[PDB]
RNA sequence: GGAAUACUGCCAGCUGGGACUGAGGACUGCGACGUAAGUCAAGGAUGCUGGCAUAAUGGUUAUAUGCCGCCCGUCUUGAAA
RNA sequence: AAGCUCGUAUCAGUUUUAUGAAAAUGAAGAGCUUUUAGUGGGCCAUUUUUGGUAAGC
RNA sequence: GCCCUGAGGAUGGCGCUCAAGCGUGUUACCUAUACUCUACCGUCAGGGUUGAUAUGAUGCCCUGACGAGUAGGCAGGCGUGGAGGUCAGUGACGAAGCCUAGACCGUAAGGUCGGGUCGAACGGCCUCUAGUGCAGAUCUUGGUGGUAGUAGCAGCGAAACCACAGCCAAGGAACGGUUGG
């Protein structure tokens, strides 16, 4: 289960430079250690700050404001694969940011074969109104009075032998 | 004895194991109907009367109902049921560990069994079908899951 | 790495010892990072370790710790006269931390009761591994092992 | 649970059915398989037909008879599929195979006895909807089986008079239900309902 | 009257073994009506008896019984490990076994 | 005397390797000096070589199943030595003792209460 | 001769850390802010 | 040591005097008999010849 | 405006189900309960019950079968061969 | 293997520091004469190479 | 990202397709001589022990760790020929040897006893002594088999050779001698 963390670093302030830029970003990780490692990697890559002169001011966990509210999430993702790195944008209809990022990671590992090692979450934002969604598969669930069945349900059997010839009707 | 040990045998070190009384399970309460699992009376429903000092349960059929007399049964080899029958009206204090000693049935044992049966028959008849339930033996059937059945 | 592990008394698998945090010792831990897992133990874990697997070294003999007199006889020179004093010294590094650490025999720990929790141990803890530097999960790992 | 289990092989996967039957056999359970010709295998027909040829093409040069044996009956094919899943060439494996019987259709007296199915081996429960599948009977007929016509002819008779038996059972259950209904609302019936019956 | 059974019938699968090594001292027993380790937890400590007919009569009867006990659960299918005073012949793989309700705790 | 339970750690004789296969090879154990010998390397599935591990406990060493140490006896004088160790030692009569001396030895052992490991030797009642 | 593991068998636990009795009686483990 | 072991020896010798019990209550009808192998041979081959 | 729950960590918190071990051998010590006498789970198990002399039980051979095991010795080459 | 002097400050297949000589961890099993069996086969594999063109080599 | 083309055999077989194939994440479970606790053998190191031990101070015990291994080194032991001593030893009421789908003791070399043949010497223990311990050396002396009642000259009757042997499929330096038929 993923979790959202906030990490800030200001590169061990020295003489003549008190309170540096104080780089701030949000990191999604399953634990504090992984969040700190990802923050260090992002600082090394995007910025010129390394752990040699770095410092973790504070790490905090951010909880989604409305864990029971359905939202459409627009995520900008930059990931690396066998080919060169390129930007990517996707839209996810989920309830919480953590679930949306988890689904994005699962899709990337499934379709693009990209795993957590080479995936960067640039930004996660909520789409407020309809007709701003640019993906058809997300617009699919926005239709008014959406009703559909669940044909051919895969019923589970607790016994090897069943004297019923079960039907998959729903 | 007057005889000094004819050979050198090391004496036992002071043991520290108190003979604490048995901590019986909550399900076992006097007057509860019990089911026998192993022995000559295996599968015979019986009643619980008194707890003996030798960590054994004094159980009566009653004898007049199913033929089971006052016998000593280990707790671990008994299933305790939720059903209970009044036992305050039955005298059981007389029975003890020495009562069952064996030094053609003893007349005193028969008289005690008759008294216990007379005392407990009224309580058994206090509820319908209780005598028939006690008389009937207990056995398992296809589809019976002991870990799912409630006793 | 083998020489560093021997210097740290980590001569066998599932064995650990308390190491003072210093600029020099940090380099040693980094050198043997692949072969060891370490973190920041809490008070409860240290107390449990000292209480269960607390063995002292007396005249080259691994005498188990079962009485305050045993600690007082050897560790009473520095004022440590009880197991609680030893635990306090270990958790709160003090002037005589080295002596207390040396007196304690290296801990002999078992495999985790619930398992290591990862399909592959030989990986960095930041990527679903076992070795590395686990800040707070070391307490849980030790408790399962202990 | 049952001294002997009769499994209806119609609309079942050869692989899963054979695996479960072999596992039950290793557990000391007697199983009888019926309607083997109706067994189904995943994939299009040509793929299954091509697969059969490449296992019989390995006829030994010096001794073909003592070498691979190619059986065309669907029951023989099912037995071969299940045989490989059991540790044959051993007493334990040989004894287990003795507990399994495979027949085409439902020969008596099994025709008059209850039969069961394996939910985890049903073709209509595992295969994705709309995917191609192969029938064991058609494959056997293509590869040399010559008894499909008679099998179908005498299986149709099996349904004949068994429909009549079911009709008689339905008529009897009509009266049984009427007797139960007229016996309802009684003191004994009310007590049984209160006690979960 | 119709039935006098006071035990749960089971099947002996095989000894606790690796891919190429087996430990006859521990036997795996399948209990009917048990599907999860939680259900099998109730059967722990129950006596296990294997009943078979012997050609020779020794004690006035043609039935010889080997006793055992339930040690711990095995796997996720309800299989439970069992240890007997004398290990099973290894020919009883799949043979029926009897599990009693004593020593009972319910 | 409830002596400690006797544990042997092994009940099968350490037969020499290939003793059964080759008749000329005696069953008496002999370590294999072959450099490439599998037995010398204790490969899996091979006989188990004797080693210090199988050492019997000191308290249970030289203890018969009855719990009495065996002691060879050649005459009444030798038997008299076990007067103070009847509960710990059991008299054993040598195979060369004749019936005439054996009966006398048995009578004295019974009088002294010393158990005889091998009674009824060459004597018929 | 035999090691009595603390954290159980309170008898041995009371031999060491005499403050254990005070901790248990005072319920200091569940102290409230 | 000397006192204790002397007392033990005296007790053992005194309790060994119970041998009179065996001699006083023996009434045995077996009186251990030994048969030499040579006598056995003469009691077997001769028996076969007589048969 | 207000509490509750999820998660983390602690309990020198409480209490059930199962398996193996019984090692030491008259007291010397660390400890607890108890005003005291005394007791205790405190440097290793005690008490009771059931089977037994035409015994209980144990030992050897083959076959009955879960699994494994290349044919021994010397010598080549870093090895097997 | 025997002897003497001994436990230490005799040291490290370690780390920092210093100079361009001072601490951490562990071991106190360390120091000096005498001789006493055997030992000078090499394979696998990273980096240099010895340089290069179908490749090796 | 996945699929096809794109150049006597085996994912091991049985086999599988919302996989029992592919990628990712979480729980559930199996085990090695690996690790934790305990029973025992031995090595090392330390320690206790006598106005004498409720067992040979070369005795009796407490504590901790360790135990792979070719040649070589050190240490402790089993067995035999003979000799000095010793059991005022065993033995025609049976010594030695041999056999034994008998047991006991020791981790083992080996020892003891139970039963059958046997008949006249041998053993318990401290030392001395050596022509002192066999699985091979295309070993020596002797005996017996497969080949074989075969070749061969109804009857008589071998020799070469003999660790193990002739149904096959993949791969283990052409090594060929575990999954199937």
mmCIF file of C-alpha atoms (C1' of nucleotides) in Angstrom, chain K residues 42-143:
data_model
loop_
_atom_site.group_PDB
_atom_site.id
_atom_site.type_symbol
_atom_site.label_atom_id
_atom_site.label_comp_id
_atom_site.label_asym_id
_atom_site.label_seq_id
_atom_site.Cartn_x
_atom_site.Cartn_y
_atom_site.Cartn_z
ATOM 1 C "C1'" G K 42 35.183 -35.596 23.169
ATOM 2 C "C1'" U K 43 39.054 -31.168 22.729
ATOM 3 C "C1'" C K 44 40.534 -26.692 24.729
ATOM 4 C "C1'" A K 45 40.587 -22.813 28.775
ATOM 5 C "C1'" G K 46 39.500 -21.457 33.649
ATOM 6 C "C1'" G K 47 38.083 -22.987 38.518
ATOM 7 C "C1'" G K 48 36.808 -26.087 43.266
ATOM 8 C "C1'" U K 49 38.717 -30.311 46.118
ATOM 9 C "C1'" U K 50 43.259 -32.532 52.470
ATOM 10 C "C1'" G K 51 43.750 -31.658 60.229
ATOM 11 C "C1'" A K 52 41.088 -36.012 53.957
ATOM 12 C "C1'" U K 53 36.997 -37.614 50.178
ATOM 13 C "C1'" A K 54 29.870 -41.178 52.080
ATOM 14 C "C1'" U K 55 35.026 -44.180 44.326
ATOM 15 C "C1'" G K 56 42.206 -45.134 42.011
ATOM 16 C "C1'" A K 57 43.884 -36.028 43.605
ATOM 17 C "C1'" U K 58 46.515 -40.284 37.204
ATOM 18 C "C1'" G K 59 40.415 -39.624 41.687
ATOM 19 C "C1'" C K 60 35.182 -36.520 41.956
ATOM 20 C "C1'" C K 61 32.998 -32.174 40.079
ATOM 21 C "C1'" C K 62 31.312 -26.532 38.192
ATOM 22 C "C1'" U K 63 31.673 -22.970 34.201
ATOM 23 C "C1'" G K 64 32.123 -21.187 28.267
ATOM 24 C "C1'" A K 65 33.180 -22.184 23.414
ATOM 25 C "C1'" C K 66 34.386 -25.445 19.753
ATOM 26 C "C1'" G K 67 33.845 -30.195 16.510
ATOM 27 C "C1'" A K 68 34.631 -29.907 7.799
ATOM 28 C "C1'" G K 69 39.237 -31.566 5.571
ATOM 29 C "C1'" U K 70 43.664 -34.587 1.502
ATOM 30 C "C1'" A K 71 49.487 -35.455 2.975
ATOM 31 C "C1'" G K 72 52.039 -34.689 7.758
ATOM 32 C "C1'" G K 73 52.255 -34.193 13.157
ATOM 33 C "C1'" C K 74 50.481 -35.187 18.142
ATOM 34 C "C1'" A K 75 47.330 -38.041 21.554
ATOM 35 C "C1'" G K 76 44.247 -42.358 23.390
ATOM 36 C "C1'" G K 77 42.845 -47.229 22.380
ATOM 37 C "C1'" C K 78 41.283 -52.835 19.796
ATOM 38 C "C1'" G K 79 43.634 -57.921 18.104
ATOM 39 C "C1'" U K 80 47.629 -62.143 17.620
ATOM 40 C "C1'" G K 81 52.766 -65.557 18.139
ATOM 41 C "C1'" G K 82 55.988 -66.125 22.599
ATOM 42 C "C1'" A K 83 58.143 -64.694 27.658
ATOM 43 C "C1'" G K 84 58.403 -62.911 33.326
ATOM 44 C "C1'" G K 85 54.640 -62.265 36.977
ATOM 45 C "C1'" U K 86 49.712 -63.022 38.584
ATOM 46 C "C1'" C K 87 44.099 -65.151 39.328
ATOM 47 C "C1'" A K 88 46.451 -71.628 45.597
ATOM 48 C "C1'" G K 89 42.109 -69.370 37.268
ATOM 49 C "C1'" U K 90 39.108 -72.251 33.744
ATOM 50 C "C1'" G K 91 38.472 -77.534 31.929
ATOM 51 C "C1'" A K 92 36.217 -84.983 30.406
ATOM 52 C "C1'" C K 93 29.962 -82.684 35.076
ATOM 53 C "C1'" G K 94 33.830 -80.485 28.286
ATOM 54 C "C1'" A K 95 39.692 -75.987 27.035
ATOM 55 C "C1'" A K 96 40.509 -74.443 21.891
ATOM 56 C "C1'" G K 97 38.236 -73.925 16.963
ATOM 57 C "C1'" C K 98 33.789 -73.671 13.917
ATOM 58 C "C1'" C K 99 28.415 -72.672 12.876
ATOM 59 C "C1'" U K 100 24.471 -69.596 14.716
ATOM 60 C "C1'" A K 101 16.721 -65.878 10.303
ATOM 61 C "C1'" G K 102 20.224 -65.165 19.348
ATOM 62 C "C1'" A K 103 21.060 -61.301 22.817
ATOM 63 C "C1'" C K 104 24.247 -57.917 25.650
ATOM 64 C "C1'" C K 105 28.478 -54.049 26.030
ATOM 65 C "C1'" G K 106 31.613 -50.120 23.583
ATOM 66 C "C1'" U K 107 30.901 -44.252 18.431
ATOM 67 C "C1'" A K 108 34.549 -48.284 16.439
ATOM 68 C "C1'" A K 109 38.767 -51.492 16.236
ATOM 69 C "C1'" G K 110 36.501 -55.741 19.326
ATOM 70 C "C1'" G K 111 34.723 -58.359 24.108
ATOM 71 C "C1'" U K 112 30.850 -61.241 26.821
ATOM 72 C "C1'" C K 113 27.107 -64.658 27.132
ATOM 73 C "C1'" G K 114 22.423 -68.097 24.898
ATOM 74 C "C1'" G K 115 21.965 -72.937 21.438
ATOM 75 C "C1'" G K 116 24.448 -77.302 17.775
ATOM 76 C "C1'" U K 117 29.440 -80.267 16.160
ATOM 77 C "C1'" C K 118 33.878 -80.794 18.331
ATOM 78 C "C1'" G K 119 37.362 -82.920 21.439
ATOM 79 C "C1'" A K 120 42.368 -81.456 25.837
ATOM 80 C "C1'" A K 121 44.298 -77.079 26.200
ATOM 81 C "C1'" C K 122 43.394 -72.121 27.114
ATOM 82 C "C1'" G K 123 42.208 -67.600 29.326
ATOM 83 C "C1'" G K 124 41.100 -62.420 33.441
ATOM 84 C "C1'" C K 125 45.260 -58.407 34.351
ATOM 85 C "C1'" C K 126 50.982 -55.239 34.633
ATOM 86 C "C1'" U K 127 55.018 -55.343 31.663
ATOM 87 C "C1'" C K 128 58.835 -57.338 27.662
ATOM 88 C "C1'" U K 129 59.134 -58.994 22.849
ATOM 89 C "C1'" A K 130 57.678 -59.148 16.696
ATOM 90 C "C1'" G K 131 58.485 -63.350 10.936
ATOM 91 C "C1'" U K 132 51.924 -58.952 14.717
ATOM 92 C "C1'" G K 133 46.236 -57.326 11.729
ATOM 93 C "C1'" C K 134 44.740 -57.528 4.039
ATOM 94 C "C1'" A K 135 40.355 -55.795 -0.777
ATOM 95 C "C1'" G K 136 43.522 -55.751 -4.830
ATOM 96 C "C1'" A K 137 50.042 -55.854 -6.206
ATOM 97 C "C1'" U K 138 47.863 -58.745 -14.918
ATOM 98 C "C1'" C K 139 50.695 -61.359 -6.442
ATOM 99 C "C1'" U K 140 52.195 -66.595 -4.658
ATOM 100 C "C1'" U K 141 50.164 -72.021 -2.964
ATOM 101 C "C1'" G K 142 45.574 -74.491 -2.939
ATOM 102 C "C1'" G K 143 40.282 -75.188 -3.942
#
